[PDB]
């Protein structure tokens, strides 16, 4: 045996254990645009309830037309990081619209939220500083922290008391600056961070407050500005990282929004911004259209909140356990991974499209279906999906 | 004075000393599509010699039209990671076409090359393994390796004897599996990895060979297939990472190409792939067309080769320390950061667009201009370019 081929056997062994544990993930091949209804390459039309397309913007024809126009005026790719020849007028324009929307001085675009998190902490913090994370923070945040030299603290999920004991330890350990950082809305359970309480704890210790708004920007708060708007601390957030790939168009791209001098150091020093391609023109141009849509009317935001309130009461009525609260992320816990796989594949036979979350996406013993509400769902699709959730939801033992 | 405001003052202090050191980067706002000539918002139209638009596909009309049709048929955003509702028939087709193009059994798409490298090493290698890296490996590779638990060795730049020293040491230190990793073509100096020696050196020790092919894919090799074709190792590479935002369209996306079991484990566990948005339907669609163009004829990469040799031989006979060759990346060393901004500025006034390179993009005191060739350039621009370099080179003590 050569070491190389041996390595391929340990890879094949790992792939077979993952199957055996029922933890293997099967891709489904959609053949149409992203939509509240969608058809896979088998011709079966189904109702999509597991997309980050909260506002219906991923195939919105005005967003589509803005991409078409931005291709005619601004080309297909730039093939350059921002500082060489990758900055068009669109990137500056969008950065100003994002900053105004989010309530901040400035904004720096990234290829993804993953990279915005990836290049945030290492640029702003050093070995003498501390970051204190909610224990449920998105993987991209964990990896951004791991790439920094800062001292690390984690506090129990949404546990404000634990947040206080960590800031005490952090101060006891002699932290210089301290950044408290959390998902604005948590990906896997839909809970909303208590930014109002966390603003207060932070001011008391003198710590910065950052949030990751991938599941909030565009539809949280009455004006859809985000978790910080929904919790009364709009204009009082040190650092907003977020995505363009969810409620604001769903194509690609991300951002960090902060004061002008934080953003300025990120342009000078943040490794995904120096060493990774700029956002494509068509994506930036459509993103500007998305901010016009949302600053002219809260109709999509409001319609989304209605579909969630309808569909959450609906799942409550059937004896399903309504995790979290107002949010469009409805996590239907099943704990066992195999049941999650069964329920998802049985809902596909009943014409509903959701998928199973299990390790490593969610902790072991905590598998689930994440149902996601879009503003685009019609009553027929929703009342139909409730039936399909009812049948399978009894036909497999969930109640 | 509160802790938060002191942090912000620290950031402002840091910005200032970046300006004083001659290291502050200023973006140019381009009002036009990417191309051989470009116009900033000040109306000036200049010759672009600093893009990754190596093949001119960034604004190629058939590429722009394929993005249009992809918008029509497959929408604008998918707003999902791949394992949920983020997989369309396009992603599958392109993963196959790339595997065929690169010599591999399968491909996995990422949002960028930065994230392809980000999620490689941590998914394949453990604390008991090793990674041997060329000292000048790309920042994204260093960051991928940092995120894994593998032991890290470093060999001197392109030094085949030192590569053998690390391989010996790693075995002596008891490494289980070993992966030797390198830029195919190196970002800041244009040198080509000696893949042919490395594949033989790696074979003695049963090590894996992995290569980053951003500055290669599309135009290196006879049929433009990469640094591995140009070294006659095509079909014999364990891992290829690479981008679509350089020669292959310039918009977004990346990939890792490997034996079907590597790719399958990356799908199961690679953190960027599970946890970050899928590539946008327009980019995959235009990417499939780019491979249509490049697999139909070698003309574009063939005239990139001509533009490179003409321009390399030109700067040589002008007095520039520029070797004759066909490395589309032509480094112009300047060492001083201030002298690099001045050379870029003076070349701008003379009708040529290039940008200074300085710390942390290159080592302190090793500042440069990175001329970058493209298949787009006609001889009248190539010639007018040379004239700009002869003069500003004369004016600044460079020749
Ligand atoms: C070898 C290598 N790998 C990976 C990446 C990341 O590529 P992507 O844009 O995320 O797809 C780059 C980006 N190279 C830049 C550039 O040379 O212009 C940077 C200034 O080094 C690269 O050179
Ligand atoms: C809080 C947070 N930050 C960052 C990201 C990555 O953002 P981007 O796609 O790289 O722009 C996500 C993606 N959430 C995904 C999803 O929930 O479907 C994933 C399965 O966790 C997120 O929830």
CA distance A307 to A47: 14
Is B9 a domain residue? Answer: no
Q: Which residue has the tokens 């787009």?
A: B376
Co-location of B72 and B39 in the same domain: no
Structure tokens, A34 = 């992203």
CB B73 within 8 A of CB A53: no
CA distance A332 to A389: 10
CB B216 within 8 A of CB B185: yes
CB A242 within 8 A of CB A113: yes
Q: In ligand 1, which atom is closest to the CA atom of A274? A: 20
Q: How many CA atoms lie within 13 A of B62 on its CB side?
A: 11
Is B4 a domain residue? Answer: no
Question: To one decimal place, what's the resolution in Å?
Answer: 2.5
* DSSP conformation letters of A282-342: HHHHHHHHHHHHHHS--HHHHHHHHHHHHHHHHHHHTT----SSS-SEEEEEEESHHHHHH
> Residue A360: is the preceding peptide bond cis (ω within 30°)?
yes
Residue B63 is given by DSSP the state H
Co-location of A231 and A352 in the same domain: no
Structure tokens, B232 = 């006659």
Contacts 24+ apart (CB under 8 A), B19-23: B21/B337, B22/B336, B22/B337, B22/B338, B22/B341, B22/B358, B23/A268, B23/B337, B23/B358, B23/B359
CA distance A104 to A111: 20
Point out which residues pair with A353 in neighbouring strands: A48
Structure tokens, A266 = 């990120």
Point out which residues pair with B242 in neighbouring strands: B255
Could B3 and A138 be called an inter-chain contact, meaning their C-beta atoms sit closer than 8 Å?
A: no
Co-location of B281 and B334 in the same domain: no
CB A37 within 8 A of CB A385: no
User: For chain B, what's the residue count?
Assistant: 399
CATH code at A180?
3.40.640.10
Is A27 a domain residue? Answer: yes
Which of B9, B60, B76 to mutate to test binding with chain A, by most A CBs within 10 Å of its CB?
A: B76
Distance B390 CA to ligand 2 centre (A): 50
CB A161 within 8 A of CB B296: no
Distance A133 CA to ligand 2 centre (A): 16
Co-location of A288 and A310 in the same domain: no
Alpha carbon A19 to chain centroid distance?
Answer: 27
CB A102 within 8 A of CB A226: yes
CA distance A163 to A137: 13
How many domains would you assign to chain B? 2
Co-location of A98 and A109 in the same domain: yes
Interface A–B counts its CB contacts (< 8 A) at 341
Apex A191 CA angle, A189 and A197, nearest 5: 150
CB A285 within 8 A of CB A90: yes
* DSSP conformation letters of B171-210: HHTT-SSEEEEEESB-TTT--B--HHHHHHHHHHTT-EEE
Strand order in the sheet with A329-335: A329-335, A367-372, A356-357
**Buried (b) or exposed (e) across A294-320, using 16+ Cβ within 10 A?**
beeebebbebbbebbebbbebbeeeeb
Is B13 a domain residue? Answer: no
Co-location of B132 and B66 in the same domain: yes
CA distance A358 to A331: 12
Co-location of A111 and A190 in the same domain: yes
CA distance B6 to B283: 43
Which of B246, B277, B369, B374 for mutating ligand 1's site (highest number of atoms within 8 Å of CB)?
A: B246
Range of the domain at B201: 61-296
Which of A138, A239, A254 for mutating ligand 2's site (highest number of atoms within 8 Å of CB)?
A: A138
CA distance B24 to B87: 41
Co-location of B268 and B188 in the same domain: yes
Could A27 and B177 be called an inter-chain contact, meaning their C-beta atoms sit closer than 8 Å?
A: no
Report the gap between the CA of A249 and the closest CA in chain B (Å): 6
Is B10 a domain residue? Answer: no
CATH code at B385?
3.90.1150.10
> Which chain A residues have a beta carbon less than 8 Å from that of B206?
2-4, 6
> Which chain B residues have a beta carbon less than 8 Å from that of A281?
33, 251
Cβ-based burial of B260 (10 A; exposed 0-12, middle 13-18, buried ≥19): middle
CB B262 within 8 A of CB B188: no
Q: Among B6, B122, B349, B225, which Cα is nearest to A176's?
A: B6
CB A202 within 8 A of CB A231: no
* Structure method: X-ray
Co-location of A251 and A353 in the same domain: no
Co-location of B172 and B290 in the same domain: yes
Distance B333 CA to ligand 2 centre (A): 41
Is A8 a domain residue? Answer: no
Report the gap between the CA of A309 and the closest CA in chain B (Å): 22
> End of a domain among B296, B322, B341?
B296
Is B334 a domain residue? Answer: yes
Co-location of A30 and A74 in the same domain: no
Report the gap between the CA of A192 and the closest CA in chain B (Å): 19
Is A212 a domain residue? Answer: yes
The chain A residue lying nearest B273, using CA atoms, is A114
Co-location of B69 and B181 in the same domain: yes
CA distance A291 to A36: 21
> End of a domain among A253, A269, A295?
A295
The minimal CB distance from B143 to the residues A63, A147, A205 is found for A147
> End of a domain among A274, A295, A316?
A295
Could B89 and A29 be called an inter-chain contact, meaning their C-beta atoms sit closer than 8 Å?
A: yes
Apex A205 CA angle, A202 and A211, nearest 5: 25
> Which chain B residues have a beta carbon less than 8 Å from that of A258?
none
CA distance B53 to B58: 6
Could A75 and B52 be called an inter-chain contact, meaning their C-beta atoms sit closer than 8 Å?
A: no
């Amino acid at each position: 045996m050569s070491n190389a081929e041996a390595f391929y056997a340990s890879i094949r062994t790992e792939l077979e254990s993952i199957r055996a544990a029922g933890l293997f993930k099967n891709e489904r091949v959609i053949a149409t645009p992203q939509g509240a209804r969608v058809r896979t390459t088998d011709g079966r039309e189904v109702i999509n309830l597991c997309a980050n397309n909260y506002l219906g913007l991923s195939s919105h024809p005005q967003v589509i037309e803005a991409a078409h126009e931005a291709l005619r005026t601004h080309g297909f790719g730039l093939s350059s990081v921002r500082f060489i020849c990758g900055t068009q007028d669109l990137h500056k324009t969008l950065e100003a619209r994002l900053s105004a929307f989010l309530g901040t001085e400035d904004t720096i675009l990234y290829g993804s939220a993953f990279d915005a998190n990836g290049g945030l902490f290492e640029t702003l913090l050093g070995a003498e500083d501390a970051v204190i994370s909610d224990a449920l923070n998105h993987a991209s945040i964990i990896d951004g922290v791991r790439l920094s030299k800062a001292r690390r603290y984690r506090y129990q999920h949404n546990d404000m008391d634990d947040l206080r004991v960590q800031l005490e330890q952090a101060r006891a350990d002699g932290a210089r600056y301290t950044l408290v950082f959390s998902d604005g809305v948590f990906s896997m359970d839909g809970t909303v961070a208590r930014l109002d309480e966390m603003r207060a704890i932070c001011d008391e210790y003198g710590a910065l407050l950052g949030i990751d708004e991938c599941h909030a920007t565009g539809f949280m708060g009455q004006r859809g500005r985000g978790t910080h708007e929904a919790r009364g601390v709009f204009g009082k957030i040190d650092i907003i990282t977020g995505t363009l790939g969810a409620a604001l168009g769903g194509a690609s791209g991300g951002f960090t929004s902060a004061r002008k001098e934080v953003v300025a150091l990120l342009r000078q020093r943040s490794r995904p911004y120096l060493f990774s391609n700029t956002v494509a023109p068509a994506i930036v141009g459509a993103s500007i259209a998305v901010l016009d849509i949302l600053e002219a009317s809260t109709e999509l935001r409001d319609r989304l909140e209605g579909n969630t309130r309808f569909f959450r009461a609906g799942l409550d009525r059937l004896g399903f356990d309504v995790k979290a609260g107002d949010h469009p992320i409805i996590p239907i816990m099943v704990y066992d991974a195999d049941k999650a796989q069964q329920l998802a594949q049985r809902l596909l036979e009943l014409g509903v499209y959701v998928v199973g979350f299990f390790y490593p996406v969610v902790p072991k013993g905590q598998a689930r279906i994440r149902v996601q509400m879009s503003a685009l769902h019609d009553e027929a699709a929703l009342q139909a999906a409730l039936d399909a959730f009812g049948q399978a939801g009894r036909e497999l033992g969930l109640i």
